[PDB]
């Protein structure tokens, strides 16, 4: 899809700085994913520097994977600062639905407003439920997008992305991603780079297609978890116009 | 050994959720080790969600590698919650004997009760000493198991595992593991998966044999630290009945 | 250069313990870099064990990449403890100049005294400016070294290291390092190992040459970010006298 190739080019030409207030398991992993793609990561959470860092950044990615009271304070404050400045925010509600704490904090951030909400079926369904696979996943994506007035992506074998009016289905990816931790978190981080250079719906769709293709390419070279993980970074770096043209599996729905 | 092949099969069929309250150096590393083996990891420490997360989990792994007062509180509380629910607990006393703080916290957790205590000679000897290589390592393993009323593993060139009555010696492994950080921590995390599906003595022995074989297989493919580390995950995923049958080096002692 | 080959040999013969109070993104990464080189890492920050850990260590590496009020307290206390004991300190002012918080904390640590200050042009220039490319980088390195009464390294395409009286230029390295996060942090950690066995100027210069060569060797084997990252550890382990003799690009300036 044309806007995907152009978005990737924009990310690499502009080299956006993506501020991550993320979890301990994906600190290095999402930073390297961003660098491989062509963006620049910065991980910071101290309330003493949140304003200056978010001012410096082009986008903010919030990941609650390993949150606690201290990080929650930083994440909520960051959301308020980013919204005041108009810096796009990407939220990955890791574990929402698993514990009330995660569901509560996710809704708290969503109440203030984010630009992209990205999670799996269970996480997004839990958020929409508390607040109030294909056809059902598509409906969930749309309802959540309207409910939270933002662009939502419900990831899965087939990913669905919607801003409430338009919807895209992404078929790229590989099941071995299930054996590498924080892959959805990598997508959230990459989305941060794309949203810095293009609107939310196209940015998130572009992130899913790009990462999904990288996963397919990585598997071609490595059939096992360890080597496969390494190849993900290789392909986030190597993916280009020709690869997207030949591997992209995405369509607009409805 | 037959119970090892069966334990591995059980881990992969049941896909247990292993809750880790661990150290910053091994967050990603132990999560990916668990995923490669066939289990599911979850890293969480917030006191606001410990009960719900431990309720969700099938086993709890505590690693004090980078502890502080805040994490200590979470670890002790987790131990009390897990014991009330009957969820097996694996403790890796990283650095016990190196600082009083680590020795103290380890004994505090052991006093409440764990199902598996796993560490090297120095760590376990320090715990047994404060509380109160082969032949000496074997005796240490046994005395510690009776002292702390649990299954203990003293890792080394040859690993010893004992529940106080029975003891096993594991000869699998490779010295290059000494050049990859947190490998013992990987074993503790994997033990969490095994203990969710089989009793402590067999679970820990199975974890040591499985990881030890993965280390041997990884070295066959990679002779240097970086590439060797990557291959560990590949083999935790590839190891199967035939590999265990042909590579396992384990025997019951006494 | 002869003192580099000898320093590397000393690191591997003595296997120094390098205490790191570092950032979340480089926890595993710097630990494995140290192990590959031949040193032993230990990551600890709890005020309850700082004294015992620094007493145990041969050098202390402080990295403010993901600091907060809690870690700042630990870092400042560690600096005071290390100086009282005479344990060499390496400071990597990650992000100094980006936020006042990072600049402030860096200067606070520098005021108490460190043995090696290592950062890029922007970070060191911000510290020297607040306190008060080649020719300019060289002048910066020298002025900063005299200003902070320590050995300073301003990293870049060409690295400059000076203790205020003597200066060295390092030409080794590869641009792909820009696509792997925390590479400068890896150098700071390695410097911790070298400074434990040789004086600051030679230790830092040796660290830059060794890592720079590892980068060149890694690129020869891997042209993409993921695989390249893995090969860095392989070569920190494989580099030896012959490789240094044939690849080293370093000279004393002035």
XYZ file of N, CA, C and O in Angstrom, chain C residues 72-250:
716
model
N 19.622 8.362 41.759
C 20.560 9.470 41.928
C 21.207 9.364 43.304
O 22.417 9.526 43.453
N 20.381 9.093 44.307
C 20.850 8.957 45.679
C 21.897 7.849 45.749
O 22.953 8.015 46.366
N 21.607 6.721 45.106
C 22.535 5.595 45.095
C 23.839 5.938 44.377
O 24.923 5.586 44.840
N 23.733 6.624 43.244
C 24.911 6.993 42.466
C 25.833 7.973 43.184
O 27.059 7.840 43.131
N 25.246 8.959 43.853
C 26.038 9.941 44.579
C 26.706 9.281 45.782
O 27.876 9.533 46.068
N 25.962 8.424 46.475
C 26.493 7.723 47.637
C 27.615 6.785 47.204
O 28.644 6.684 47.871
N 27.408 6.097 46.084
C 28.409 5.175 45.558
C 29.698 5.917 45.239
O 30.792 5.421 45.497
N 29.562 7.107 44.666
C 30.724 7.909 44.311
C 31.514 8.269 45.566
O 32.740 8.223 45.574
N 30.807 8.620 46.633
C 31.477 8.979 47.871
C 32.166 7.764 48.496
O 33.289 7.863 48.984
N 31.499 6.613 48.462
C 32.061 5.380 49.013
C 33.291 4.936 48.222
O 34.336 4.621 48.800
N 33.166 4.914 46.898
C 34.270 4.511 46.038
C 35.485 5.414 46.230
O 36.612 4.931 46.288
N 35.264 6.722 46.325
C 36.386 7.636 46.510
C 37.070 7.439 47.861
O 38.289 7.541 47.961
N 36.293 7.150 48.899
C 36.877 6.925 50.217
C 37.773 5.687 50.183
O 38.840 5.667 50.796
N 37.337 4.662 49.456
C 38.084 3.408 49.348
C 39.172 3.428 48.280
O 40.064 2.577 48.271
N 39.094 4.388 47.369
C 40.087 4.454 46.318
C 39.764 3.532 45.155
O 40.660 3.104 44.433
N 38.488 3.199 44.983
C 38.084 2.352 43.865
C 37.834 3.293 42.681
O 37.089 4.264 42.802
N 38.460 3.025 41.522
C 38.246 3.906 40.371
C 36.792 3.991 39.917
O 36.067 2.994 39.924
N 36.376 5.194 39.532
C 35.011 5.442 39.084
C 34.949 5.908 37.633
O 35.703 6.791 37.226
N 34.048 5.304 36.860
C 33.838 5.679 35.464
C 32.421 6.237 35.371
O 31.464 5.582 35.788
N 32.285 7.446 34.839
C 30.969 8.057 34.699
C 30.587 8.257 33.241
O 31.350 8.826 32.470
N 29.407 7.775 32.868
C 28.905 7.962 31.514
C 27.665 8.828 31.710
O 26.610 8.331 32.114
N 27.780 10.136 31.429
C 26.713 11.135 31.565
C 25.672 11.082 30.457
O 25.400 12.096 29.809
N 25.084 9.908 30.252
C 24.087 9.728 29.203
C 22.982 10.778 29.228
O 22.229 10.885 30.195
N 22.892 11.561 28.161
C 21.849 12.564 28.089
C 22.147 13.906 28.723
O 21.277 14.776 28.738
N 23.351 14.087 29.262
C 23.699 15.374 29.852
C 23.515 16.393 28.729
O 23.886 16.135 27.585
N 22.926 17.540 29.050
C 22.689 18.549 28.033
C 21.282 18.441 27.470
O 20.737 19.415 26.946
N 20.694 17.251 27.578
C 19.334 17.007 27.093
C 18.307 17.457 28.133
O 17.237 17.960 27.789
N 18.625 17.251 29.407
C 17.740 17.677 30.488
C 18.624 18.227 31.596
O 19.757 17.772 31.772
N 18.115 19.213 32.326
C 18.868 19.822 33.415
C 19.155 18.782 34.491
O 20.214 18.796 35.116
N 18.195 17.887 34.704
C 18.320 16.829 35.702
C 19.577 15.993 35.465
O 20.333 15.718 36.395
N 19.806 15.600 34.215
C 20.975 14.795 33.881
C 22.268 15.592 33.973
O 23.294 15.076 34.413
N 22.214 16.854 33.563
C 23.386 17.719 33.627
C 23.733 17.960 35.094
O 24.897 17.876 35.497
N 22.708 18.256 35.888
C 22.885 18.520 37.313
C 23.494 17.335 38.058
O 24.466 17.494 38.800
N 22.924 16.151 37.863
C 23.429 14.958 38.534
C 24.851 14.625 38.086
O 25.684 14.215 38.896
N 25.136 14.806 36.801
C 26.474 14.529 36.290
C 27.500 15.439 36.967
O 28.556 14.981 37.401
N 27.185 16.726 37.059
C 28.098 17.682 37.683
C 28.268 17.406 39.173
O 29.342 17.627 39.735
N 27.208 16.912 39.805
C 27.227 16.592 41.226
C 28.227 15.463 41.483
O 29.000 15.496 42.443
N 28.206 14.460 40.613
C 29.110 13.324 40.727
C 30.537 13.768 40.395
O 31.496 13.387 41.073
N 30.671 14.583 39.352
C 31.978 15.084 38.943
C 32.607 15.960 40.027
O 33.829 15.986 40.185
N 31.769 16.671 40.774
C 32.259 17.543 41.835
C 32.920 16.713 42.928
O 33.918 17.122 43.515
N 32.358 15.541 43.199
C 32.922 14.664 44.210
C 34.179 13.994 43.667
O 35.099 13.682 44.423
N 34.222 13.787 42.353
C 35.399 13.198 41.741
C 35.261 11.819 41.131
O 34.818 10.876 41.788
N 35.642 11.710 39.861
C 35.610 10.444 39.140
C 36.985 10.263 38.505
O 37.775 11.205 38.444
N 37.271 9.056 38.035
C 38.559 8.767 37.426
C 38.516 8.832 35.910
O 39.530 9.082 35.264
N 37.333 8.607 35.349
C 37.132 8.666 33.907
C 35.742 9.211 33.615
O 34.760 8.776 34.219
N 35.671 10.184 32.712
C 34.398 10.769 32.279
C 34.372 10.446 30.792
O 35.270 10.814 30.050
N 33.330 9.744 30.366
C 33.208 9.352 28.971
C 31.868 9.667 28.336
O 30.859 9.163 28.764
N 31.853 10.469 27.287
C 30.608 10.798 26.627
C 30.809 11.324 25.231
O 31.950 11.442 24.787
N 29.723 11.641 24.527
C 29.869 12.180 23.179
C 30.098 13.687 23.243
O 30.095 14.281 24.321
N 30.295 14.306 22.085
C 30.560 15.738 22.029
C 29.506 16.598 22.728
O 29.842 17.467 23.524
N 28.235 16.353 22.426
C 27.172 17.134 23.034
C 27.122 17.046 24.548
O 26.946 18.059 25.231
N 27.285 15.839 25.078
C 27.241 15.624 26.521
C 28.395 16.299 27.250
O 28.182 16.999 28.238
N 29.617 16.100 26.768
C 30.768 16.707 27.420
C 30.788 18.227 27.252
O 31.167 18.950 28.169
N 30.371 18.717 26.090
C 30.363 20.158 25.871
C 29.333 20.815 26.788
O 29.546 21.919 27.280
N 28.221 20.125 27.026
C 27.178 20.655 27.897
C 27.661 20.720 29.345
O 27.334 21.656 30.075
N 28.442 19.724 29.756
C 28.966 19.678 31.119
C 30.018 20.754 31.357
O 30.048 21.381 32.415
N 30.890 20.956 30.376
C 31.935 21.966 30.490
C 31.319 23.361 30.416
O 31.782 24.294 31.077
N 30.272 23.494 29.608
C 29.608 24.775 29.463
C 28.858 25.177 30.715
O 29.008 26.295 31.206
N 28.047 24.260 31.233
C 27.265 24.512 32.438
C 28.200 24.766 33.616
O 27.985 25.685 34.405
N 29.243 23.949 33.722
C 30.218 24.073 34.801
C 30.796 25.483 34.873
O 30.920 26.056 35.957
N 31.142 26.040 33.717
C 31.708 27.378 33.682
C 30.671 28.475 33.546
O 30.877 29.451 32.823
N 35.111 18.805 13.433
C 34.958 18.166 14.724
C 36.265 17.824 15.416
O 36.398 18.037 16.618
N 37.240 17.316 14.666
C 38.517 16.913 15.252
C 39.289 17.903 16.136
O 39.531 17.606 17.305
N 39.698 19.056 15.611
C 40.435 20.005 16.450
C 39.569 20.473 17.613
O 40.046 20.619 18.739
N 38.291 20.704 17.336
C 37.358 21.158 18.357
C 37.100 20.065 19.397
O 36.987 20.348 20.587
N 37.011 18.819 18.943
C 36.777 17.693 19.847
C 38.002 17.496 20.735
O 37.883 17.200 21.924
N 39.182 17.666 20.148
C 40.429 17.514 20.889
C 40.536 18.577 21.975
O 40.906 18.282 23.108
N 40.215 19.816 21.622
C 40.274 20.913 22.578
C 39.263 20.687 23.700
O 39.554 20.941 24.867
N 38.077 20.203 23.341
C 37.033 19.945 24.329
C 37.501 18.903 25.337
O 37.365 19.086 26.546
N 38.050 17.807 24.826
C 38.534 16.729 25.674
C 39.538 17.250 26.700
O 39.426 16.955 27.888
N 40.512 18.032 26.238
C 41.532 18.592 27.121
C 40.979 19.544 28.173
O 41.306 19.423 29.354
N 40.170 20.508 27.739
C 39.600 21.482 28.666
C 38.736 20.810 29.720
O 38.763 21.192 30.891
N 37.972 19.806 29.303
C 37.109 19.086 30.231
C 37.954 18.298 31.227
O 37.620 18.222 32.406
N 39.052 17.716 30.753
C 39.931 16.941 31.625
C 40.540 17.821 32.713
O 40.651 17.409 33.870
N 40.934 19.036 32.348
C 41.520 19.948 33.324
C 40.430 20.510 34.234
O 40.620 20.647 35.444
N 39.283 20.825 33.645
C 38.163 21.370 34.400
C 37.707 20.419 35.506
O 37.518 20.829 36.652
N 37.543 19.146 35.160
C 37.077 18.148 36.116
C 38.177 17.316 36.765
O 37.892 16.352 37.478
N 39.428 17.700 36.526
C 40.583 17.007 37.092
C 40.465 15.490 36.965
O 40.570 14.760 37.949
N 40.266 15.020 35.740
C 40.115 13.592 35.501
C 40.467 13.289 34.053
O 40.855 14.184 33.301
N 40.354 12.023 33.670
C 40.615 11.626 32.297
C 39.268 11.710 31.600
O 38.263 11.216 32.113
N 39.245 12.350 30.439
C 38.006 12.505 29.702
C 38.131 11.944 28.304
O 39.186 12.029 27.674
N 37.044 11.352 27.831
C 37.002 10.814 26.489
C 35.769 11.394 25.814
O 34.666 11.327 26.356
N 35.978 12.008 24.656
C 34.885 12.549 23.867
C 34.835 11.595 22.679
O 35.727 11.590 21.830
N 33.804 10.763 22.646
C 33.658 9.776 21.589
C 33.049 10.337 20.305
O 32.295 11.307 20.335
N 33.394 9.715 19.182
C 32.887 10.139 17.889
C 33.535 9.313 16.793
O 34.138 8.279 17.082
N 33.408 9.751 15.539
C 34.013 9.031 14.421
C 35.459 8.775 14.836
O 35.995 7.684 14.652
N 36.074 9.806 15.401
C 37.429 9.721 15.924
C 37.252 10.035 17.406
O 36.620 11.033 17.755
N 37.767 9.175 18.278
C 37.641 9.415 19.713
C 38.887 10.117 20.219
O 39.984 9.884 19.714
N 38.712 10.978 21.215
C 39.835 11.673 21.830
C 39.794 11.393 23.324
O 38.731 11.442 23.946
N 40.954 11.081 23.886
C 41.074 10.783 25.308
C 42.221 11.619 25.843
O 43.297 11.644 25.245
N 41.996 12.302 26.960
C 43.038 13.135 27.545
C 42.940 13.210 29.060
O 41.848 13.144 29.627
N 44.091 13.343 29.709
C 44.135 13.467 31.159
C 44.555 14.897 31.476
O 44.858 15.232 32.619
N 44.563 15.734 30.442
C 44.939 17.126 30.610
C 46.359 17.425 30.169
O 46.678 18.560 29.812
N 47.217 16.412 30.193
C 48.610 16.586 29.789
C 48.907 15.832 28.497
O 49.569 16.361 27.606
N 48.432 14.590 28.409
C 48.630 13.761 27.221
C 47.282 13.497 26.562
O 46.249 13.469 27.232
N 47.298 13.289 25.252
C 46.065 13.041 24.519
C 46.267 11.978 23.450
O 47.313 11.927 22.797
N 45.258 11.127 23.284
C 45.290 10.064 22.290
C 44.077 10.172 21.379
O 43.000 10.589 21.808
N 44.263 9.795 20.119
C 43.186 9.805 19.141
C 42.961 8.358 18.724
O 43.913 7.645 18.410
N 41.704 7.925 18.739
C 41.360 6.559 18.358
C 40.528 6.595 17.085
O 39.475 7.231 17.049
N 40.999 5.909 16.048
C 40.306 5.893 14.760
C 39.482 4.633 14.499
O 38.771 4.560 13.494
N 39.578 3.651 15.391
C 38.836 2.402 15.232
C 37.341 2.574 15.473
O 36.915 3.503 16.164
N 36.555 1.665 14.899
C 35.113 1.716 15.056
C 34.376 1.535 13.742
O 34.991 1.366 12.687
N 33.050 1.557 13.806
C 32.235 1.413 12.609
C 30.910 2.128 12.812
O 30.329 2.077 13.897
N 30.432 2.790 11.765
C 29.190 3.545 11.849
C 27.941 2.755 12.218
O 26.982 3.335 12.720
N 27.933 1.446 11.983
C 26.741 0.669 12.316
C 26.476 0.664 13.823
O 25.384 0.309 14.265
N 27.474 1.061 14.609
C 27.304 1.125 16.055
C 26.158 2.083 16.350
O 25.517 1.998 17.396
N 25.906 2.998 15.416
C 24.831 3.954 15.596
C 23.455 3.314 15.573
O 22.465 3.948 15.951
N 23.380 2.060 15.132
C 22.103 1.353 15.065
C 21.929 0.326 16.178
O 21.006 -0.491 16.145
N 22.824 0.363 17.159
C 22.744 -0.541 18.301
C 22.726 0.371 19.524
O 23.601 1.215 19.686
N 21.731 0.209 20.386
C 21.626 1.079 21.547
C 22.623 0.795 22.667
O 22.985 -0.357 22.930
N 23.071 1.868 23.317
C 23.999 1.746 24.427
C 25.404 1.260 24.123
O 26.034 0.629 24.974
N 25.910 1.539 22.925
C 27.262 1.106 22.592
C 28.288 1.947 23.350
O 29.328 1.442 23.773
N 27.995 3.230 23.533
C 28.907 4.073 24.285
C 28.908 3.592 25.727
O 29.924 3.660 26.424
N 27.758 3.092 26.171
C 27.619 2.589 27.532
C 28.431 1.306 27.683
O 28.950 1.014 28.760
N 28.535 0.539 26.601
C 29.329 -0.685 26.633
C 30.781 -0.278 26.848
O 31.506 -0.903 27.619
N 31.203 0.777 26.157
C 32.574 1.262 26.282
C 32.861 1.737 27.705
O 33.947 1.507 28.233
N 31.889 2.398 28.327
C 32.071 2.872 29.699
C 32.245 1.678 30.631
O 33.095 1.691 31.524
N 31.440 0.638 30.421
C 31.525 -0.564 31.249
C 32.873 -1.259 31.067
O 33.490 -1.698 32.040
N 33.332 -1.357 29.822
C 34.617 -1.997 29.538
C 35.752 -1.182 30.148
O 36.739 -1.739 30.632
N 35.611 0.140 30.111
C 36.616 1.026 30.682
C 36.749 0.709 32.169
O 37.837 0.794 32.739
N 35.634 0.341 32.793
C 35.664 -0.006 34.203
C 36.603 -1.174 34.449
O 37.310 -1.214 35.461
N 36.612 -2.133 33.527
C 37.488 -3.293 33.655
C 38.949 -2.886 33.454
O 39.826 -3.301 34.209
N 39.208 -2.067 32.440
C 40.570 -1.624 32.162
C 41.143 -0.730 33.254
O 42.316 -0.849 33.602
N 40.321 0.157 33.803
C 40.808 1.070 34.832
C 41.130 0.345 36.140
O 41.826 0.877 37.004
N 40.639 -0.882 36.275
C 40.913 -1.671 37.468
C 42.340 -2.223 37.409
O 42.916 -2.578 38.438
N 42.915 -2.282 36.210
C 44.262 -2.825 36.051
C 45.322 -1.885 35.463
O 46.488 -2.261 35.356
N 44.927 -0.676 35.080
C 45.875 0.284 34.519
C 45.375 1.714 34.710
O 44.185 1.935 34.930
N 46.282 2.684 34.641
C 45.894 4.078 34.838
C 44.837 4.547 33.838
O 44.792 4.075 32.703
N 43.966 5.480 34.263
C 42.860 6.079 33.505
C 43.058 6.425 32.029
O 42.235 6.052 31.193
N 44.124 7.148 31.697
C 44.340 7.515 30.300
C 44.546 6.291 29.416
O 43.916 6.162 28.367
N 45.426 5.392 29.839
C 45.701 4.180 29.073
C 44.524 3.210 29.111
O 44.262 2.506 28.140
N 43.817 3.177 30.235
C 42.670 2.283 30.387
C 41.549 2.656 29.420
O 41.012 1.802 28.711
N 41.198 3.938 29.398
C 40.133 4.418 28.529
C 40.518 4.277 27.057
O 39.701 3.862 26.233
N 41.763 4.618 26.727
C 42.233 4.500 25.350
C 42.166 3.034 24.931
O 41.748 2.717 23.818
N 42.575 2.139 25.828
C 42.550 0.709 25.530
C 41.124 0.216 25.294
O 40.882 -0.614 24.419
N 40.185 0.727 26.081
C 38.787 0.323 25.953
C 38.223 0.738 24.599
O 37.517 -0.031 23.947
N 38.546 1.956 24.177
C 38.062 2.478 22.905
C 38.648 1.737 21.712
O 37.947 1.476 20.735
N 39.930 1.393 21.789
C 40.576 0.669 20.702
C 40.018 -0.749 20.623
O 39.648 -1.229 19.552
N 39.950 -1.415 21.769
C 39.436 -2.777 21.815
C 38.005 -2.863 21.293
O 37.688 -3.720 20.467
N 37.139 -1.975 21.767
C 35.744 -1.999 21.332
C 35.607 -1.578 19.873
O 34.783 -2.121 19.133
N 36.413 -0.600 19.470
C 36.372 -0.125 18.098
C 36.751 -1.222 17.122
O 36.153 -1.354 16.053
N 37.759 -2.007 17.488
C 38.205 -3.116 16.652
C 37.128 -4.200 16.625
O 36.867 -4.802 15.581
N 36.504 -4.451 17.774
C 35.455 -5.464 17.843
C 34.327 -5.074 16.896
O 33.724 -5.931 16.243
N 34.053 -3.774 16.818
C 33.001 -3.265 15.943
C 33.353 -3.520 14.476
O 32.506 -3.935 13.684
N 34.609 -3.269 14.114
C 35.057 -3.493 12.746
C 34.962 -4.976 12.397
O 34.486 -5.337 11.323
N 35.418 -5.828 13.313
C 35.386 -7.273 13.103
C 33.959 -7.798 13.025
O 33.661 -8.702 12.245
N 33.075 -7.235 13.841
C 31.687 -7.671 13.837
C 31.043 -7.330 12.498
O 30.316 -8.140 11.923
N 31.320 -6.137 11.987
C 30.737 -5.737 10.716
C 31.210 -6.645 9.581
O 30.459 -6.922 8.646
N 32.451 -7.114 9.661
C 32.981 -7.992 8.621
C 32.111 -9.240 8.501
O 31.947 -9.792 7.411
N 31.558 -9.671 9.632
C 30.712 -10.861 9.684
C 29.207 -10.610 9.618
O 28.451 -11.507 9.245
N 28.773 -9.409 9.988
C 27.347 -9.080 10.005
C 27.101 -7.625 9.617
O 27.514 -6.708 10.322
N 26.401 -7.428 8.503
C 26.119 -6.098 7.969
C 24.833 -5.442 8.465
O 24.551 -4.292 8.119
N 24.055 -6.162 9.268
C 22.786 -5.635 9.767
C 22.774 -5.576 11.296
O 23.384 -6.413 11.955
N 22.064 -4.585 11.872
C 21.932 -4.322 13.313
C 21.785 -5.474 14.303
O 22.476 -5.497 15.323
N 20.879 -6.408 14.028
C 20.683 -7.523 14.940
C 21.877 -8.459 15.013
O 22.416 -8.720 16.092
N 22.294 -8.971 13.860
C 23.435 -9.882 13.794
C 24.731 -9.175 14.182
O 25.624 -9.781 14.773
N 24.830 -7.895 13.840
C 26.011 -7.097 14.164
C 26.157 -6.985 15.684
O 27.255 -7.129 16.224
N 25.042 -6.736 16.367
C 25.041 -6.613 17.826
C 25.597 -7.889 18.463
O 26.436 -7.832 19.363
N 25.123 -9.036 17.987
C 25.561 -10.329 18.503
C 27.070 -10.527 18.330
O 27.757 -11.003 19.240
N 27.582 -10.157 17.163
C 29.002 -10.313 16.871
C 29.919 -9.421 17.703
O 31.118 -9.683 17.797
N 29.374 -8.369 18.306
C 30.196 -7.496 19.139
C 30.748 -8.294 20.323
O 31.928 -8.190 20.661
N 29.890 -9.100 20.944
C 30.299 -9.921 22.082
C 31.289 -10.982 21.632
O 32.247 -11.287 22.342
N 31.045 -11.556 20.456
C 31.934 -12.583 19.932
C 33.351 -12.052 19.820
O 34.306 -12.720 20.220
N 33.490 -10.842 19.288
C 34.815 -10.275 19.120
C 35.459 -9.669 20.355
O 36.682 -9.565 20.423
N 34.662 -9.280 21.340
C 35.250 -8.753 22.568
C 35.946 -9.937 23.234
O 36.893 -9.775 24.006
N 35.465 -11.131 22.904
C 35.998 -12.386 23.429
C 37.181 -12.885 22.593
O 38.186 -13.343 23.135
N 37.053 -12.789 21.271
C 38.094 -13.263 20.357
C 39.289 -12.340 20.160
O 40.385 -12.804 19.846
N 39.091 -11.039 20.327
C 40.194 -10.112 20.122
C 41.403 -10.530 20.959
O 41.273 -10.899 22.125
N 42.577 -10.495 20.339
C 43.808 -10.880 21.010
C 44.963 -10.004 20.531
O 44.752 -9.019 19.820
N 46.182 -10.372 20.909
C 47.354 -9.595 20.521
C 47.494 -9.395 19.017
O 47.727 -8.281 18.559
N 47.355 -10.469 18.248
C 47.498 -10.373 16.798
C 46.468 -9.440 16.175
O 46.798 -8.639 15.303
N 45.219 -9.548 16.618
C 44.159 -8.700 16.079
C 44.425 -7.232 16.397
O 44.254 -6.365 15.541
N 44.856 -6.950 17.621
C 45.152 -5.576 18.012
C 46.317 -5.047 17.176
O 46.280 -3.924 16.679
N 47.344 -5.874 17.015
C 48.520 -5.495 16.239
C 48.173 -5.150 14.793
O 48.697 -4.187 14.231
N 47.283 -5.939 14.201
C 46.886 -5.742 12.815
C 45.745 -4.752 12.560
O 45.655 -4.195 11.465
N 44.887 -4.519 13.553
C 43.755 -3.605 13.371
C 43.794 -2.264 14.099
O 43.117 -1.324 13.690
N 44.566 -2.170 15.175
C 44.618 -0.932 15.944
C 44.983 0.316 15.142
O 45.948 0.324 14.377
N 44.184 1.364 15.323
C 44.402 2.653 14.675
C 44.332 3.676 15.803
O 43.257 4.172 16.140
N 45.484 3.977 16.395
C 45.549 4.913 17.508
C 46.889 5.640 17.516
O 47.912 5.068 17.151
